[PDB]
């Protein structure tokens, strides 16, 4: 019902658009204001915030939301740190977007619920769609 997306890049914006189409309350959070404005009309609430900062995450009650997406791809360190703050903040389900396999090993092994590497996953399915 209530969803939170951190990082409003290509992957984050795409998630928000479908989540709003299904009539669900989605929270979009991003460090860059310019990207928040792009997703402002596609989400219920749009906030410019730094999810690396522990106190900022505390105020935005992410534990109330059912699912949380960390969709930061450029900074390998920021995604790892944002995931670790979300888990200690009390988020039950944390989904993390990983760009490389080395990061995916860390995120899974520190306790992230779901690990998503967009380039690999279509790599599997595009092959499957060619096969059949």
């Amino acid at each position: 019902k209530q969803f939170a997306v951190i990082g409003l890049g290509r992957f984050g914006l795409a998630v928000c658009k479908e989540l709003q189409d299904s009539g669900s309350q989605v929270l979009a959070v991003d460090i860059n204001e310019d990207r928040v404005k792009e997703a402002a009309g596609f989400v219920s609430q749009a906030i410019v915030a730094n999810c690396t900062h522990e106190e900022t995450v505390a105020e935005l009650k992410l534990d109330d939301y059912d699912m949380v997406m960390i969709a930061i791809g450029a900074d390998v360190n920021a995604s790892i740190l944002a995931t670790l703050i979300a888990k200690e903040a009390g988020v039950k389900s944390v989904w993390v977007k990983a760009n490389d396999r080395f990061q995916a090993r860390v995120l899974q092994k520190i306790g992230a619920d779901h690990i998503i590497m967009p380039e690999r996953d279509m790599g599997i399915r595009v092959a499957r769609k060619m096969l059949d």
């Binding site: 410019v48 106190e55 935005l60």
Partner: protein
Amino acid sequence: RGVFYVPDGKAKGGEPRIILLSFLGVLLPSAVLLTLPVFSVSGLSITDALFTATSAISVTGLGVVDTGQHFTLAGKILLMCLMQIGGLGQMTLSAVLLYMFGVRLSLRQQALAQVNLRRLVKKIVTFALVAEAIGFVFLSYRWVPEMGWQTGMFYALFHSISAFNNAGFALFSDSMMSFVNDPLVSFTLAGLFIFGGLGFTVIGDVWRHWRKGFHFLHIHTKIMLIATPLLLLVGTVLFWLLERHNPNTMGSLTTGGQWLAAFFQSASARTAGFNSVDLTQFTQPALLIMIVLMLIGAGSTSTGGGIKVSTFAVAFMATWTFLRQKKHVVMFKRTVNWPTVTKSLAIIVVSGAILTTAMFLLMLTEKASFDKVMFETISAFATVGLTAGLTAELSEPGKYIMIVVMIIGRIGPLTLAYMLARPEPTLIKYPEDTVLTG
């Protein structure tokens, strides 16, 4: 704590809209309230109530009617609340917008590469009450024995609020004329609008970092801590020199009374409104000096002012940099960037344009000497409220013009500051061409 904000939506400054509607959102309900005969002994006209409501919300202190008599006890309390809303309301509102402006700056810096708002508001309210409390007890030390327990506190608490808020409203027929040689009230009021017209940022910075010393204070705090005593000193000395031999207003005083009157007028010239001495019989060279003092005003995040002391300070040292042909404007070993220099210069030129049209209009609606027209226009625009006799004989068209001058002067410099901060971005830019200046 949580440093975040919700963007307004689809990129021009909305803070000027916030300031404009906040001022109009309180003036209109206050205007209709003053029409009720519960607050006035005989009732006020729509124009008179609007002028009074504007003066109370702007805390200019200009009165088409006598405050002490025309208003009832309920009206006097109503005036008391409005000048809280005008002075402390702007001081809180400017601090809130300044806090949110920094938050947007901080997050954008993090993207490329402090207490909470509720906590800050509590200190602003706490500072206002404790300051007015100190003024209340000192003023009660004299007025309670003279007028009684209940009248003494009310007059003391009224004038403590008025002085701190830079309102200048007085419950006596003559504003502080009966206390020319009285140091207790003259200094208690002086301290109230000196610190009231100092800025929460200056008080807050000194409160939190006084132990590190003066060198490690903020640039804005250092400017206000030097220019305000400098302005008080030059105002006191220069008023004393030009008024010591004028029999009408200050020539019949004692030597200590000479300096007390000179200091009180200079302190109240910077947007307070109280006048220990008469301004009608006040010589022209001293009129110009007071006119300059009214324009220079109080601090940026204070209860009142025109263009602020920091705005005058930057332009003053920008001129010094220009004449010495230095590349950068530097104060306290800090460079003032060109956009800030442009803001300081733009506020002066825009204010002067507004003042000229306002001055031109008044000489059309009402007929008086130009020295009186300029003085009244500056007082309304700079929110000082010091009169030269033209206010009493104001006409109906003149009242409307002076209302607009009070409103524009109250919010103008702070609003024009934020328009320069966040202009609307454009994707189409035209070629640059050189225009001869000089």
